[PDB]
Ligand binder design. Structure first.
Ligand SMILES: *C(=O)c1ccc(O[C@@H]2O[C@H](CO)[C@H](O)[C@H](O)[C@H]2O)cc1
Ligand SMILES: *C(=O)c1ccc(O[C@@H]2O[C@H](CO)[C@H](O)[C@H](O)[C@H]2O)cc1
Ligand SMILES: *C(=O)c1ccc(O[C@@H]2O[C@H](CO)[C@H](O)[C@H](O)[C@H]2O)cc1
Ligand SMILES: *C(=O)c1ccc(O[C@@H]2O[C@H](CO)[C@H](O)[C@H](O)[C@H]2O)cc1
Ligand SMILES: [Ca+2]
Ligand SMILES: [Ca+2]
Ligand SMILES: [Ca+2]
Ligand SMILES: [Ca+2]
Lengths: 121, 121, 121, 121
């Protein structure tokens, strides 16, 4: 299992110790407060009122937590995943990333605290 | 394991099928959007800018998800709990509740989707 | 989870730290060598060639591992149980016992090493 | 998780659906009765009184259950493994095999019923 923080201003994302293998069942819980610029802060589901101006993940709001598994495209995590199985042929290290527009991470602030574990299967 | 919705306007709370027993390890993931009145909505951590005007749980924001276990006081759930063990002598059915001021639930809207499972121990 | 030894000559049985609660899923693995009298030894499934002359559990061979849950009757364990759920209304502390005829445990020898854990549910 | 039978006379072994990956925790429970030739039968720990005359696994008795993981050497399973982690660099499909001398499986009989699951980690 892995526990750590994902900084909102980390454009490259946070590589975890979790390697997702075919058949794996995982659970993720994410908490905390972060911003993509404004003085306010939002939770792991991001800002439901903000337009998508070229986010790294178009299936989650700006300011949401998302992930990549190996060289997959971005996958929404939001508040977390409960006993979740990845799509076919998706495998590899899990990287957690704050959802923002590439090149605009410099003014981000805060972080999410995240736990990831493999479930019995 | 239990999956279900918790309505923001349900003052009594949602009784789950989960009975927390001594030694149990549990994981909860909560997602979704709800409101304690305003036209906006907030996630399971609630509204970090709103004052506490007599919330059922003073350790979480207005609009956050909280719970009771048996006849315990309110315990913050927020976005969830990862492989969590309850305090000493806390046991019984888990009831999930939206955090608002008693008598003011009538104008609430939305709900959280919540999963609860017992972990290996 | 619980790990310990169950002596063949312990007529009262070995009380474990496991309390089986309704809904619980458990796994048990038992190993080792024991005897109900003879110089030979048998594994946790006992002696398949020996008649039942008044065993505490008539659903397992003499020399097998069995258990009681709370005040239940004896239940066969043998080599173990995989993600097992108890019958309706069966609950309480798990006691492990060597299957022999009451009053004849004094000449028994050896023991089984046993692990018990609760599974995710 | 995988459940199936391992025939005593299957020299090649029974390939399971389980792929053991680095970091995996697994539990195995094996039960039943089998023989390497004689009219008697023995459990998954095999025959503790029989000499090793060139067994595929020298760390378990003749008639015991053993396994290979990928291209590893034989590893004793016996009655099972509880929340077990493989040695460094051992990975791949789990094959279950009855422990006997190569070329002598033709007169074997019976089988073991085996469950294998991955545990939370
Ligand atoms: C209008 O209400 C508004 C527009 C942008 C904004 O913040 C920027 O959002 C960008 C992503 O859409 C990017 O993250 C910039 O760094 C932010 O300043 C707030 C409000
Ligand atoms: C301040 O501008 C403000 C005050 C109240 C409010 O909504 C109410 O909040 C109450 C709890 O504090 C309760 O939930 C009421 O039903 C809401 O109308 C928003 C903003
Ligand atoms: C005959 O083959 C035979 C009969 C009894 C025996 O051992 C006794 O078995 C009893 C249970 O049936 C009890 O455990 C006694 O303590 C044993 O001596 C071995 C062989
Ligand atoms: C001695 O009494 C004795 C010798 C062999 C035997 O069975 C054979 O065991 C071999 C492995 O050691 C192999 O499995 C043969 O197929 C068996 O016939 C029983 C007793
Ligand atoms: Ca930004
Ligand atoms: Ca309200
Ligand atoms: Ca005896
Ligand atoms: Ca043979």
């Amino acid at each position: 299992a892995w526990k750590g923080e994902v900084l909102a201003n980390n454009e490259a994302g946070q590589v975890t110790s979790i390697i997702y293998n075919p058949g794996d069942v995982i659970t993720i819980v994410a908490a905390g407060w972060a911003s993509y610029g404004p003085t306010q802060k939002w939770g792991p589901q991001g800002d439901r009122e903000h337009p998508d101006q070229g986010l790294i993940c178009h299936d989650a709001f700006c300011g949401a937590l998302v992930m990549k598994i190996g060289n997959s495209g971005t996958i929404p995590v939001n508040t977390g995943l409960f006993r979740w199985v990845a799509p076919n042929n998706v495998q590899g290290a899990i990287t957690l990333i704050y959802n923002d527009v590439p090149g605009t991470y410099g003014n981000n602030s805060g972080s999410f605290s995240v736990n990831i574990g493999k479930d019995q299967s």
